[PDB]
Symmetry: C3
Subunit: 183 residues, 3 copies
């Protein structure tokens, strides 16, 4: 059977084998990363045409988010206690995001003021993804400040926020949609 029922009393396992209540910050961080990945999946379902580079990029990002969830599930202090290795989150994906950000940023008109979330279906979906990503970042920061998670995880999520904002503007520009401003 797909379920075990071992979590019916409200406890679950980390990747170090330690059992904690399901409201622990480790599970809040893992679950919010999962929620971000799901929002990105639904946004991916909105692309009308085929062969879009940024769709491949978003799928790569989803895989990286699975890796980020795995990292968050192995707290470093319990990995030292459990005799396990370090759980080092590498910087590759961050640099990749920075490259893609430069690519899209070089193509947009300069932006000076606040944007209302808008610009077509894809663009609005990506703005919602951006807000969920920032929530995930806020869930990861306390774990970093405790020494439980590599700081590169928070760096990746922070850079993904900017990637999603820039990609929303890029999609809006390509659709001929103008986004709104003011008060």
């Amino acid at each position: 059977k797909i379920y075990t029922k071992t979590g019916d009393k409200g406890f679950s396992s980390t990747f170090t084998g330690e059992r904690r209540p399901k409201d622990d910050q480790v599970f809040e961080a893992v679950g919010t990363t999962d929620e971000l990945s799901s929002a990105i999946g639904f946004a991916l379902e909105l692309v009308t045409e085929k062969g879009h580079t940024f769709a491949e990029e978003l799928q790569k990002i989803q895989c990286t988010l699975q890796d980020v969830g795995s990292a968050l599930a192995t707290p470093c202090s319990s990995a030292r206690e459990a005799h396990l290795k370090y759980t080092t989150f590498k910087a590759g994906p961050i640099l990749e995001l920075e490259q893609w950000i430069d690519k899209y940023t070089s193509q947009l008109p300069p932006l000076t003021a606040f944007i209302l979330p808008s610009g077509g279906k894809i663009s609005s979906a990506l703005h919602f993804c951006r807000a969920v990503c920032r929530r995930a970042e806020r869930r990861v920061v306390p774990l970093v400040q405790m020494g439980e998670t590599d700081a590169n995880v928070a760096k990746f999520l922070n850079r993904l926020s900017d990637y999603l904002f820039t990609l929303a503007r890029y999609a809006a520009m390509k659709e001929g949609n103008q986004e709104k401003i003011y008060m």
Copy 2:
């Protein structure tokens, strides 16, 4: 402070949800589309007021919300029980926006009770949940869609 960051992020999440909902209106000329965009602007104001001993936040938008609520209420049949979140694409999206707005209100309340932000922000988010509920009902009615009540 972390609470300020959380409240601001949740108001931003609400505005983004409302934007995606707006993307579901297939016709132009809808007054409530303009109302939702004006609400997005007011949410920008809410976010700047939270990121301040606190910033003043005028109460006019709350009256705007109450007027719109009355306008829509006088067009709807009486409702005495809970309904299932439903009623067409726009109505369902607006129910989800209503849930996110109530989450944002929960994030703003402790800031107000600490005296770190103006109470009008909190009562705006409150009235806003009510506006979103009424507008979801109204959008469902205008499409001829069925209002599901479970007992």
Copy 3:
């Protein structure tokens, strides 16, 4: 205008600030039900029975909302129908899961949220359901909420995963599969 001050009431008459755990739990259950509503608005084109199932789940979520709003420490006798959350719905979920499991190919690798609009929407619903479970667990481990509520949410996570897989299979969509590096 009641509650403009930041306070609200439980169904037992207790007044608490709106940031209390009970309101976080009830609000997240509401959010889950609304996400299911939107997913249902995508489903109403073809797929039949599982739309009935999703609506039943919404009704059950209204019942769990009633349970969470009636803390056991304050519950009088006339509130006993609300504090007792029966196990029926849980078993129903298991039944439905078994049904869909008999029609799917066996699962070997990790799945990315994908598989068409219905499937992706259900994956998002699953994530919101797990957030709701995390909000309900502190009330249960405090003795304020029937444990069957947490059991129901834990099983609903798996129901939604399996239903996403089923919708993707019926639409002919292949889900995307996790790949290292």
